[PDB]
Design an enzyme around this catalytic site. Structure first.
Site, PDB file in Angstrom:
ATOM      1  N   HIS B  27       0.695  -1.265   0.063  1.00 48.78           N
ATOM      2  CA  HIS B  27      -0.134  -0.099   0.089  1.00 48.78           C
ATOM      3  C   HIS B  27       0.851   1.239   0.011  1.00 48.78           C
ATOM      4  CE1 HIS B  27       0.349  -0.241   4.434  1.00 48.78           C
ATOM      5  NE2 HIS B  27       0.415   0.894   4.488  1.00 48.78           N
ATOM      6  N   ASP B  49      -0.523  -7.821   1.622  1.00 48.39           N
ATOM      7  CA  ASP B  49      -0.362  -6.478   1.389  1.00 48.39           C
ATOM      8  C   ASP B  49       1.084  -6.119   1.579  1.00 48.39           C
ATOM      9  OD1 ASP B  49      -1.149  -3.696   1.243  1.00 48.39           O
ATOM     10  OD2 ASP B  49      -1.030  -3.346   3.448  1.00 48.39           O
ATOM     11  N   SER B 101       4.792   2.326   9.732  1.00 43.79           N
ATOM     12  CA  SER B 101       4.600   1.060   9.108  1.00 43.79           C
ATOM     13  C   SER B 101       6.202   0.559   8.467  1.00 43.79           C
ATOM     14  CB  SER B 101       3.756   1.311   8.041  1.00 43.79           C
ATOM     15  OG  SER B 101       2.358   1.288   8.368  1.00 43.79           O
TER      16      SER B 101
END
EC number: 3.4.21.90
Lengths: 81, 149, 46
Positions: B27, B49, B101
């Site tokens: 993402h 992901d 992240s």
């Protein structure tokens, strides 16, 4: 007039063309082509499915190799170096 | 081991050299701010992901290991100490924000144990949404109501 | 009289050739389903 023997095998199959015709064979050929396309589509799908199987184990770390043989021709050759 | 993904000159997330692959969340928009890493060919995986590639030989010494071994207790991460228990990593709410992240959660021997993807706020503490190794294979734990950082 | 649209005979022989086509289609259909099944197993595994 002409003779439309049976076969055999095939052979005669084409002889019938002369008997009742113009057409006949061309349609059959088209059907055969469609069948080939179905066969080709199946193979393409199978290869994509084979990828789907080798997926997960596509990252890294020991773990086949291993099931890579027995292993649908790749599997391996693939595991290695 | 940690490298930053930049987009229009702005840090969006991170990329990490774990094991022998080079990871970065799928993402995350942008391209790894490192020549060697940027020119690689990544394999996307929408289920996880995740978006991995292989570490160039000249950087392989720069990777960070990993491990499936994670006993209940405290783990280490850039902002402090993460807590593991009940099959869930958590932290004091506020200590993890968007843009964290990709950051690994190490143990006390340096083995990367999970990689943060985001967190769900459940009051005092936030349950982290991480990418963690199972018996051998990768996995993703996402607590109910996670906010993707 | 006569004259009409087939198909017709010649039985046997006719079946010999017919039987060759469509079997491979069934195979690839089954294989497709099996691949889906395995995919679902992976989905469950995750």
């Amino acid at each position: 007039s002409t003779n439309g023997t049976a076969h055999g095998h095939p052979h005669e199959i084409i002889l019938y063309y002369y008997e009742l015709y113009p057409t006949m064979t061309v349609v059959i050929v088209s059907v055969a082509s469609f069948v080939l396309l179905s066969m080709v589509g199946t193979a393409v799908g199978m290869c994509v499915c084979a990828r789907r199987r080798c997926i997960t184990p596509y990252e890294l770390t020991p773990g086949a190799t291993v099931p890579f043989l027995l292993s649908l021709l790749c599997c391996v050759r693939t595991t290695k170096a | 081991c940690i490298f930053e993904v930049k987009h229009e000159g702005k840090v969006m997330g991170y990329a990490c050299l774990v094991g022998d692959k080079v990871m970065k969340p799928a993402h995350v928009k942008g391209t790894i701010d490192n020549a060697d890493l940027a020119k690689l060919a990544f394999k996307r995986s929408s289920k996880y992901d995740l978006e991995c590639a292989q570490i160039p030989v000249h950087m392989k010494s720069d990777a960070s290991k990993f491990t499936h071994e994670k006993p209940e207790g405290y783990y280490n991460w850039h902002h402090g100490a993460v807590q593991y228990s009940g099959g869930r990593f958590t932290i004091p709410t506020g200590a993890g924000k968007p843009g964290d992240s990709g950051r690994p959660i190490f143990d006390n021997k340096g083995r990367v144990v999970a990689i943060v993807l985001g967190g769900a706020n459940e009051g005092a503490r936030t349950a982290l949404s991480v990418v963690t190794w199972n018996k051998d294979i990768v996995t993703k734990i996402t607590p109910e109501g996670a906010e993707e950082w | 009289h006569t004259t009409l649209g087939v198909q017709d005979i010649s039985t046997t022989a006719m079946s010999w050739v017919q039987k060759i086509t469509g079997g491979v289609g069934l195979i690839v259909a089954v294989a497709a389903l099996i691949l889906i099944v395995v995919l679902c197993v992976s989905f469950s595994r995750h």
